[PDB]
C-alpha cells in the first residue's frame, strides 16, 4: 500500500448560491480519506481541492467536520461531504478530488 492518504470521491448534487452581487455554482462530493501507510499522517497543513482536467482548482465552500481531522492513524478511514464552488459552471467539470498543501 502507498505511504500516503488515498482520496476517494463520488460526485453528488449540483447547486447554486446567490447573495446580492455574488453568485456561485456548487458541486458536492462524498469523500473518504484512507491512510494506507503504516504510520500516522498529519493533515494539519493540507486541504481538499477539486480540480478539472485542465488543472483549474475549485475552492472548498463547506465541509463536514469528519474530514477536518488533524491526523489519520495508520489503516484508518474518515468520510464525509465536501462542497466546492466556482462563479460560473466550471466546477461542474471538477473530476478529481485530491489533497494539497496550497490552502
Ligand X SMILES: C[As](C)(=O)[O-]
**What's the closest the beta carbon of residue 102 comes to ligand X, in angstroms?**
4
- Tell me if 74 contacts a copy of itself by CB under 8 A: no
Number of other residues whose CB lies within 10 A of the CB of residue 4: 12
Kind of pairing between the strands at 22-35 and 41-42: unpaired
Confirm if 51 and 98 have CB atoms less than 8 A apart.
yes
DSSP-derived secondary structure for 12-25: EEEEEEEETTEEEE
Does position 11 interact with ligand X (CB under 6 A)? The reply is no
Closer of 68 and 74 to ligand X (Cβ): 68
Q: Is 71 in the site for ligand X (CB under 6 A)?
A: no
Integer Cα distance of 71 and 91 in angstroms: 28
Which residue of 22, 38, 44, 102 would you call a contact of ligand X, by CB under 6 A? Answer: 102
As a whole number of angstroms, the distance between CA 23 and CA 81 comes to: 21
Under rule CB under 6 A, residue 46 binds ligand X: no
Q: Which residues bind a copy of itself (CB under 8 A)?
A: 2-11, 13-20, 22-23, 25, 36, 51-53, 88-89, 92-93, 95-99
Q: Which residues bind ligand X (CB under 6 A)?
A: 49, 51, 57, 100, 102
Amino acid at each position: 500500500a502507498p505511504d500516503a492518504v488515498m482520496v476517494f470521491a463520488r460526485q453528488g448534487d449540483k447547486g447554486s448560491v446567490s447573495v446580492g452581487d455574488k453568485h456561485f455554482r456548487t458541486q458536492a462530493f462524498k469523500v473518504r480519506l484512507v491512510n494506507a501507510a503504516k504510520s500516522e499522517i498529519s493533515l494539519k497543513n493540507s486541504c481538499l481541492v477539486a480540480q478539472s482536467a485542465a488543472g483549474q482548482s475549485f475552492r472548498l465552500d463547506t465541509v463536514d467536520e469528519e474530514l477536518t481531522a488533524d491526523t489519520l492513524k495508520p489503516g484508518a478511514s474518515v468520510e464525509g461531504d465536501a462542497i466546492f464552488a466556482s462563479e460560473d459552471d466550471a466546477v461542474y467539470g471538477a473530476s478529481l478530488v485530491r489533497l494539497s498543501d496550497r490552502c
